[PDB]
Every structure is written in C-alpha cells, then in structure tokens.
Write a protein that binds this ligand. Sequence first.
Ligand SMILES: Nc1ncnc2c1ncn2[C@@H]1O[C@H](COP(=O)(O)OP(=O)(O)NP(=O)(O)O)[C@@H](O)[C@H]1O
Ligand SMILES: Nc1ncnc2c1ncn2[C@@H]1O[C@H](COP(=O)(O)OP(=O)(O)NP(=O)(O)O)[C@@H](O)[C@H]1O
Ligand SMILES: [Mg+2]
Ligand SMILES: [Mg+2]
Length: 1144
Amino acid sequence: EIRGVAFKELFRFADGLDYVLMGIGSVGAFVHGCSLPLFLRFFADLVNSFGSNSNNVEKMMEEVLKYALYFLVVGAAIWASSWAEISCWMWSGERQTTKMRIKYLEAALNQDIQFFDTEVRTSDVVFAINTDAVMVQDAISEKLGNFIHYMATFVSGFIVGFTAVWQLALVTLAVVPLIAVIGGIHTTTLSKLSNKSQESLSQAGNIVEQTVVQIRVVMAFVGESRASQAYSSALKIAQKLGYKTGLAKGMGLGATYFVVFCCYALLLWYGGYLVRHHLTNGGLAIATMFAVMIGGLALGQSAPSMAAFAKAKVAAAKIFRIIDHKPTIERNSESGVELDSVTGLVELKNVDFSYPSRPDVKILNNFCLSVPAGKTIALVGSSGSGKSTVVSLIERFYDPNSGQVLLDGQDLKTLKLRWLRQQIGLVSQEPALFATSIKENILLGRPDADQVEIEEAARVANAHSFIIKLPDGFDTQVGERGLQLSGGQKQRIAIARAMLKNPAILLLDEATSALDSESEKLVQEALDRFMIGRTTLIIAHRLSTIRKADLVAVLQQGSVSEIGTHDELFSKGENGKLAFKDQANSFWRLAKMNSPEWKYALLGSVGSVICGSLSAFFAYVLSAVLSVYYNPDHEYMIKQIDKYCYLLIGLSSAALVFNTLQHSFWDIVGENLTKRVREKMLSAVLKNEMAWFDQEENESARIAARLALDANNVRSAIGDRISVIVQNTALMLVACTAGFVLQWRLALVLVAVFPVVVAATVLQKMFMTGFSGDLEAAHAKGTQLAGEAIANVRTVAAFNSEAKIVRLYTANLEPPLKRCFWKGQIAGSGYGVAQFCLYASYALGLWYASWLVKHGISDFSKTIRVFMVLMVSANGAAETLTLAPDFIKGGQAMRSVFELLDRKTEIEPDDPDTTPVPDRLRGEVELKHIDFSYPSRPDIQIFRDLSLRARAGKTLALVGPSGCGKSSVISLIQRFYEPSSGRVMIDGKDIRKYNLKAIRKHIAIVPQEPCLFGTTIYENIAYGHECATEAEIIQAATLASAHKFISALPEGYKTYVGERGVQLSGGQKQRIAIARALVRKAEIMLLDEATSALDAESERSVQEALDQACSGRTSIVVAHRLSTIRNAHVIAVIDDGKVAEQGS
Ligand SMILES: Nc1ncnc2c1ncn2[C@@H]1O[C@H](COP(=O)(O)OP(=O)(O)NP(=O)(O)O)[C@@H](O)[C@H]1O
Ligand SMILES: Nc1ncnc2c1ncn2[C@@H]1O[C@H](COP(=O)(O)OP(=O)(O)NP(=O)(O)O)[C@@H](O)[C@H]1O
Ligand SMILES: [Mg+2]
Ligand SMILES: [Mg+2]
C-alpha cells in the first residue's frame, strides 16, 4: 500500500457546502483562539485603570466600566466563534466521512471476487470500514479545527506578550522550554512504567485465565490455593511496579510545580524591576507572563492534531487505494448479448482452472459436467475437489484461464454478466442473512417485487408460517440483536430468496446441519423436479439424492471421468434517582476492607491538604505582588517583592516534597487495595460450582477480563481520584476563608457566581477532550451491515443486489448524520453560552470591586486578592466536578465486585464442621438412585435411578455408547455436580455431608482432554501431589512406561511445554496426565478415555501402566474398545440414562 496521501487529498469528498462550513469553522476557530490573549490584555488594562487611579475614583470607575463592557464583548465573540467552530467542523467532517463511506462500500462491492484473494483480504476491508472513523471522522472533523484554534492561541499570545513587555516576554520564552522538558521527561517515564505494569497485569490475567480454563483439573486435583499463591506472586510483582510508577508520577508533578514556582518568582522579580524603571506597569507585566505561558501551552497542545493528521494520511491512502481500483468485471459486463430463451444447457467443456491465490496448483482438471438442459445433475466427489470451484465457474465468479465454459451454445465471457446471474439462482452453505428486515432479505433477490409476490414465493415454495409466529409479526428486523439464530429456518429464508428470482437453472450447493428443516422440504419445494437444469452438490452421505439426478458425474481427483447412471455408491473419495445509598454503603464496606492501611491514607490526605493550600498561596502571592506593583514607594515595593519571592521559593520546595508524598502514599494504598480486591475476587471465584463456571456469562476469558477491569477501575476511582477531590476541597476552604477575610461581600458576590464559573470551566475541559463521542459506536448499524455485505460479497454479486445494499447503507447512515448535526449545534450553543456567562461573571465581579473601592468600603489590594483567590477556587472545583464521572464508574465497578464476592456457593469446597475421615479408606462406591439434569440443558434430564456399585479395591469398566453418561459419572462421584435426588455413598458414608476436599485428595482424574500446566512437565507431574520431590517422580512416568520420550527431550523434565511451549503428541501428554494421576497416588482411581487417541505401541504401554496402577485400588475405567477392559472384575453398560446389564 501507499505510505500516505497528501493532506489536501483528505478533502476529496468535499462539496461547496462542506467548503463553506470549513471556512466558517476556520474563521470561528481563529477568533476563538485569539480571544483569550485579548482577554488577558483587557484584564491588564482593567487592572491598570483600577490600581493606577486610587486618588481619582471617577476616572477609575469610568475606565473599569469601559473594560467590563469590553469583557462582555469578548464573551459574546467567544460565544459566536466557539458555536461556529464546533458546529461547522463536526457537521462538515460527518458529511465528508459519510460520502467517503458510501463510495468506499460501493467500490468494494463492485470489485471482482479474486480481488479479495490476491489483494487485500475481507478482514482488511472491514477493518478499513471501522478505522475510517478514526481517520476522517477525527482528523478533518475536530482535530483540524483544534489545530487552527491552538495555532491562533499561540500566535495571539506571543504577539500580545511581545507587544506589552518584550523583555518579560523574552524571559518567559526562555522559561517555557524548562517546563516543556520537565513535562516530557515525566510523561516518558510514566509511560515506560505503565507499559511494564501493564505487562505484569497481563501475566496475572493469563494466570487467572488458564486457571479458569482448566478448572476441570484445578478443582479435581486440589491446588486452587496454589493458583491463589501464583496470582498473589504475580500481583506482588505488579504492585512493586505500581509503587515505582506512583513514585515517578509524584516526582514528576513535584518537579513541574517546583520549576513553575521558581520561574514565576524570577518573573515577578523582573516585573518589579521593570515597573521600578517605568518601562511598564503591573497589569501588563502579569498579562505578558500569562500570555506567553498560554502561547507555549497552545503550541504544545497541537501535537495530537498532527498525530491524527499522520494516521489519517495513512488510513486514507489505504481507503483511496481500495476506492480507485478498477474492477475486472466492469469490462467483463459489456454490451447486451442477452439471449431470449434459456434452455438450461450448461456445458463445462475441456477447461482447467487454478485460483489466482495459489496459481501453482491446478485445482481443476480435464473434465466437463455437460449439465443436461431441463434435467438435474448431482455431482459427488472428494471433499477437496473443485466442486465449489466449478460452482463459482458457472456463475463467472472467476474467469477460466483454459478453454471456455458456455451456456446454450453461447460463451459466458460474451454474456451480460448481469442477466446471466439473473438466470442462475444460488443456494450456499451459509444462508448469509443481512442486517435488514426479513421482507427486505426476500426482496433483494428480485427488486421489482411487491408484498403479494413475496408472500406467494414464501407460501407456494417452502413455507411462511414461522414468520407469523414472530415477536415483530409480519415484518421483522433480523439484524444481530433483533433476532437470533433460527437454524435451518435461516436456510429457509435463503430458499425463499432463490424463489423470488425467476425460475431458471439453479446451483444448490449444500444443506449441511439442517436436520429435516431444509433437506426433505428443500427437495420437495424449490421445484427441484421442475424448472430447467439443476446442480445439487450436497453430499449428505448420499441422502437418497443420487436417484433424483439422471447422472451422478462424480468429481473424484477433480474430474468427471466416471459418469452415468448406476448404483456405484462408493464415489472414490481421494480427499475427505439511581440507588446512591447502595453505592455509599459499598464505599463504606470497601473502606472497612481497606482498614489495615488507613494510616497511609491519612498521611496522603495530609499531603493532599498541603498541596491544596500551596496552590491557594501561589494565587495569593501573585495577587499580592500585583498589588505591590501599584505602590509609589519604591523601597517598600522592593522589600515586599523580595519577601514574596523568598516565600515563593519556599513554597516551591514544599510543593515538590508534599506533592511527591501525597502521590506516593495515595498510590501505595490504591495499589494495595486493588491487590487485596483481586485476591478476594479470585478466592471467591475458585469456590464456586462447575455449574457457575458453566454459566455462559462466566466465560474463562470473560471471567478474567471482567476481573481485571473491575479491579483496575475501582482501584483508580478510590485511590488516585480521591487525592484530587481532597486537595481541591482544601483549596476551596483556604481560598474562601482568605477572600471573606481580605474583603467580605465581594467574595460573597464571587461565591454567588461560583456555579457559573464551575460550569464554564468544566465545559472548557470537555472542549479540550472533544465534543464528539465514540464515532465507531455512532455508526454501529452501518458498519455491521457493511461488514456483513463485504464478508458475503459472493452472495451479494450472485443476486445483483449491490445497489440495494448501498442504498440500505445510506439509509442506515442518514440518522447518525442528523444526530451529529444536532449534537454539534447543541454543544456549540451550550459551550458559547457557558463562556459568555463566565466572562459576564468576571466583569460583574471586577465592577463590584471597583464600586466597593469607590464607596470607600474596601481597597484595590484586598479586592484584587479576593478576586484571584476565588477564581483559582473555581478552577479547582471545576476540576473536581470533571473528575466525578470517574467516581461514578468506579462505584459501578465496585458494586459489581461486591455482588461477585457476596455470591454464595451451595457446594462449599471446604466444610469446617464435618465428619472426620480415616487416612486409608475402603474404596467401595455406591451411586444409589441418582438422577440430574445437566445445568447446561436443564430440560434434558440425565440418568434415571442409577444403582452403580464398585467394590473395595476392584476394577469397574463401564463403557456405554458415546454421549450416554460415562464422563457424567465421574462428574458426579467427585461432587462436580449435584444430583436432583441421588445418593453417593463412599466408604459407607454419604459425600454430601462431608468435607469434599478430604476425599478429593484421594481421587485421581484423567479426562479426555489432556490438560497441561505452566512451562515444565516436571511441575505437571508434581501437580498430583504437592510434595512429590523426586522419589515420587520415580514412582511417576518413570514407573509408568513414559520415561523414554521425556528423557529423549533436549531439556528432559524442564522441557518447554504448554500452549506457548512445545506442542507434544496426544499420547505423550496423555501418559503425562496418567503420571500425574499416579503421583496423586489416589486410593480411588478414575480412568476416562485412556485408549482413544494413541498408537499401537503407546496404547500397549499405557495398558500395562494402567494395569499396574490399578493393582489393589478401586478403579473406574471407560473406553470404547472392550478388548482393553475385558480383564476387569465387572463391566457396566448405560444407555440413554438407563441402567443396562451390570453384573457381566
Ligand atoms: N480463493 C481460494 N484460493 C485458493 N484455494 C481456494 C480458494 N477457495 C477455495 N480453495 C480451495 O480449493 C479447493 C477446492 O475446493 P472448492 O471447490 O473451492 O470447495 P469445496 O471444497 O468443493 N466446498 P464444499 O462443496 O462446500 O465442500 C479446496 O481445498 C478449497 O479450500
Ligand atoms: N460441557 C458440557 N456442556 C454441555 N453438556 C455437556 C457438557 N459435558 C457433558 N455434557 C452432556 O452430558 C451428557 C453426556 O455426555 P458424555 O457422554 O459425558 O460426553 P463425552 O465425555 O464427550 N463422550 P465421549 O466423547 O464418547 O467420551 C450429554 O447430554 C452431553 O451433552
Ligand atoms: Mg460448494
Ligand atoms: Mg469423553
């Protein structure tokens, strides 16, 4: 594929309206970006007029009113600009993306079939559908507007700073790289530590996933405690990594604060020096500092836009590669050579063909079907022969490279390729129902049909009664959630589609796994005896279909050299309000669980409060310094500025130390809690019935994924997020008290407009994040329909329904387009209103301060201090409200955690109060009057009044047929399942009233699937007995005729084994499992299909090994072949849950 396209190529699908929208959005973004430095300049001018005219109250009042009106104007401009930018950019991006998706799907469906074999795969095409969102609905939708906005902010801030005071602007410009470098180092270290911690968490998740997968053996052989120990060790490694990550984050933030405070101290001293020499005034100095800092931050904030631009260039290069490719069928489908009377004579002629994917091999050979016109052919040959290949050749999916295939004496290469597919009606292995309605699914076979025609096609051919008995009635949306799998009924629908097409020659490929739904009724309906020409390719083990066709024309080896009418069945065969109180109780319970380290939290909280206070003090200092700038006494101003700079240096050191302290302690408690929670979740999971594991929702991978997610999110919400809330509350209190002390009433007016500022700042944070949600989730219906169409491209092209699919795609994509337009309008209007109210609040507060000064109630210094302090308070409160949704999510996750932990188990693995057991049992087992319905199928009851009996030390060899009991017995003898009314007697004792684990220490399991653990075979053998050492390993496979091959391995015992290890043979791993069972040294032995997948010598050796093992101990054996089990005391037979002859 191309490396990338030009940035200007992203706007290929932009029309005039899109150009107008982009122009308006660019203008709005530029004005919105430039507004903030203009606000800083106007604030500086207001402060100058407010502090430089203490003697002249009239002039200062007039100028303060003037600049408050300027603030209102800036607020209105921000409102208009933000509205225009957000709405126009979102809507134009959505429109261009929708057009691009429509044309991409059209081009992909118009492509030739072989294009999906040699060129990009189907999975690549659906991935392109999915990633089109993050490409175009992201780069040109909001990232471009953000880039323009941030360039405007950076340029305007630099211009304002260098036009107000150029010396201070240069100093701040020198300052900015220091903070940039500190932030970059902090982010790099944090990302590295996060990667390491994620790797450790992935290892722990793998451990829990394997435990849940092999819970079959993890419970049978006690050792779920060992799984808990392994999980604890992995979590301890992850906990050390988390401690390192938290310490790194704390040091990074502390260094950032230290550098910021020291640099601002130097800047304030230099500003005082400049004010002394009458080069400037205090307001312009502060505005210059803030404007240059804002410009630097804006320049920093445009990097994600560039990253999105690069990713979009790559993905758009891929999409344009797919779009611009010219299909092969376009020149194949040429001027009208359609006939006027089809007879149904398909002659394959001498043609051979090879797939372009693997041209070396010739799948097709020298043969010709020569389908008789008006008569049915039914070819049955091999499983890997060109049956589906010749089917595709008939429909001209692939152009033959040798010879030619012709219809009614006319070459297929010369036909319409549209009319041709109109004659042939195809039935495939997969019905391939689309996301649209059932009636639309029927209609896409023939677009020029109405409801009566659909009803007659469904009724006369096949049936339609199943459609009526549907929740949605006559018309139903099958989709992916509206309806579920209907089995052969889905196939039924396909047949109906084939019956909406005009009656002609048909290609009916397969009806496998349809039961009676669409085999007998399929051959009865669909005019399998009527019409002209058919090709029934179904094998179905020769389900009487051969007699239907006049000729068989077998396809052995890939040829029809054997053809005619006969009874030769052997056709060769070469191949084949929500509950907040519950949430609060959950927090109380979790914190009670987190008691053993409450002390840590307190110390963290202490750091928390300090940090909050420090922030407040910083604000105060700035305001104080600003006030000191407007003082005629030069020496007094020098002394005050020096004092404030020294205090700021001290504050920087304290901020570094205490910020590191708070982050370290809160991350410590957070990591410890999330670890304790994970251990508790695993311990509760491993103490559940197998039926609980049977639960579909309790999938091994899902069980692991759910655990990880709930653990991490609750951890974050309770540990990292809280520190923020506490420090922000500290800031609020100190800021509030300082304001009402320096100047009350003004602070009261400020706290009155507090919610307005909080809302405006939280909307600013949301704007920084982005005002468009999950774009992939917005186009879910469209993307799943497109994926279904692309995966089934052969069926789409067979029915000539590309245009119908494209128009359905447009119909599915329109509602998201309208929703995006309205969402953009609402978001822009709300953001603009919030910003306008914010600036109105600023103007009102400043004007009230000026009025208070005029009336002699207060002074410039106190009013300015209260103002700045309260504004930083509002910023902190807005940050807290921004972080609150994470607390909501954490509450949901911890509710899930607590409902999992509080779940009770009916079969408790350990019973502290139970009957004691002798060290050595007797070995007798009595399964008396047992019966139960497997939890998977409660409707299907298994076993009726079974009376199985195994004597002390004797061998039982129950066999049965496949699927009738067998394993179920060993799933009940050892309490994997609960009989409805059964009795299990062991050593003259019922097992229900017993400790369970105590006998399961004396039971050995060798299931059908030879499960293996970890990476070394030695530990796999040792799993049977936790104190195996090496002598029992001699008593292991060493003494079970399974030592030669393991010694032949390069590493011997410590040989890499497992899913990621060496894939051993079935017999070798089976005797590994046998060795594990011997190491268990169980008094009661349970064999389970030990002679199923072994070679002759391996089967023999396993036979003597098991015969030696069973000596003197009761054993239950199941095996299909009776020759191995004839040398047993008793043999039992079961069938359909009933008890057959058992004595012999
Ligand atoms: N695009 C392809 N490229 C390469 N090999 C393919 C391709 N499609 C199918 N094959 C293989 O070609 C061989 C011939 O089988 P084919 O006639 O394609 O289907 P089939 O096995 O007859 N299907 P079915 O009738 O359902 O049992 C098989 O090994 C296929 O897996
Ligand atoms: N994991 C399972 N989920 C659902 N049903 C099950 C499961 N395991 C066993 N059954 C049912 O238990 C009954 C008896 O199956 P069973 O004979 O134990 O199977 P098997 O061990 O796979 N047989 P075989 O392959 O001949 O050794 C059948 O109704 C099965 O469908
Ligand atoms: Mg086929
Ligand atoms: Mg089995």
